[PDB]
Amino acid sequence: ANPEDMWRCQTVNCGYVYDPDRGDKRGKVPPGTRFEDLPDEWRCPICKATKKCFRPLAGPGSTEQPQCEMPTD
């Protein structure tokens, strides 16, 4: 719901947003699943980045640079 618990994939050519109220069909994640509670083997359904490539939409994390393994910035 709120931008604070939505997370955007930061790789350079992506832009998927994980929405907890939607879940994630391609990753078999049911609606209501918080970003923290995602499996450890979960990847971005678009670009397949790990969750280290994601950033909350607003609030403190949203201005930090994520510890991401694929190209970003």
Note the residues at the interface with its own copies (CB under 8 A): 1-3, 6, 8, 13-17, 19, 26, 45-46, 57-58
**Is 53 annotated as ligand-binding?**
no
Q: Could you say which of Fe ion, its own copies, none residue 11 binds, taking C-beta under 5 to 8 angstroms by partner kind?
A: Fe ion
Residue recorded with tokens 């609606």? 31
Whether the Cβ atoms of residue 70 and residue 13 lie closer than 8 Å to each other: no
Token output for 30: 């049911």
Token output for 45: 């359904």
Which residues are part of a known binding site?
9, 14, 44, 47
Feature table: binding site for Fe(3+): 9, 14, 44, 47
